[PDB]
Amino acid sequence: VEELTEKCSLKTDEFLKAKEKINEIFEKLNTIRDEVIKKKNQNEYYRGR
């Protein structure tokens, strides 16, 4: 049961780490998309200029 508690704790830790990593990857993709949209706004403003 102490081994089960350690196994449940490590599985929850791995689930939290995997979810945090995938959420951070999704947020990094969102930030990259935002940076690309900002660069597109800069590009369209440069095209307007």
Binding site: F15, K19, I22, F26, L29, N30, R33, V36, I37, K40, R47
Partner: protein, 264 residues
């Protein structure tokens, strides 16, 4: 035998609470978020590249490979969850079938003469997931595959359902698809296509034609069928073609004006 540790025991109501609590981690939300992210990334990439810049084929191939891998992973996850549900159902049925240990049945199980279902052995014996009855074909995959041809030229005939080589033998004879409708001289603001007609319409004059008639024949040739307003669905291909055509005409006008002024 020896140390009294039986291989397996019949399920108990207290054990049943934990069995009910146990579940596969659900990734459906994560898969939907990943699919939305990749789809929006493809949509951003469609107009991100400079119209003058050419050579997007490798990026399109890489994204297609990533999408195919994601689809395979999603199919494997569906197989995993369905296998988990089937294993749980089989285990609960087997546990219900098996008798309960009270005085000596536990001793018989410990001696190994009596056997009870074990989730670990059933999970090890569970058949490996198979990507069967899964077709990796989506609207996003189709638009991603066809966007390089649209980038090369607005009018193309990529589908080869009628014949693998081309639309007909070696000669397409398909003419060109015009962004400007002959009925309405404007770009398609609302490109809608029917699943049966397979033709894109602006819907500005199509709604008026459908008004007063429950079903109307498709105005375009090469088909004979009647469809309602609800049959039409959004077609991203037509809007992508219109956007790329606008970007190319704008860039060519800018370049020609700049070159002419530089000459003077």
């Amino acid at each position: 035998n020896d140390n009294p540790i039986p291989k397996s025991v019949p399920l108990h109501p207290k054990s049943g609470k934990y069995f009910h609590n146990l579940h596969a981690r659900d990734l459906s939300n994560i898969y939907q978020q990943c699919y939305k992210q990749i789809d929006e990334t493809i949509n951003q990439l469609v107009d991100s590249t400079s119209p003058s810049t050419i050579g997007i084929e490798e990026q399109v191939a890489d994204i297609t490979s990533t999408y195919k891998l994601l689809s395979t992973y999603e199919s494997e996850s569906n197989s995993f969850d369905e296998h988990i549900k089937d294993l749980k159902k089989n285990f609960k049925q087997s546990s219900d079938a098996c008798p309960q240990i009270d005085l000596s049945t536990w001793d018989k199980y410990r001696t190994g003469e009596l056997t009870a279902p074990k989730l670990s052995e059933l999970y090890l014996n569970m058949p490996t997931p198979e990507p069967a009855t899964m077709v990796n074909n989506t609207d996003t995959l189709k638009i991603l595959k066809v966007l390089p041809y649209i980038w090369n030229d607005p009018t193309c005939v990529i589908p080869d359902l009628q014949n693998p080589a081309d639309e007909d033998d070696l000669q397409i004879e398909g003419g060109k698809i015009e962004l400007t409708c002959p009925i309405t001289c404007k770009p398609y603001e609302a490109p809608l296509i029917s699943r049966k007609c397979n033709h894109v319409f602006d819907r500005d004059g199509i709604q008026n034609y459908l008004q007063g008639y429950t079903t109307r024949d498709c105005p375009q040739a090469a088909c004979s069928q009647v469809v309602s307003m609800r049959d039409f669905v959004r077609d991203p291909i037509m809007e992508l073609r219109c956007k790329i055509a606008k970007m190319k005409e704008s860039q060519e006008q800018d370049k020609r004006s700049s070159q002419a002024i530089d000459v003077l």
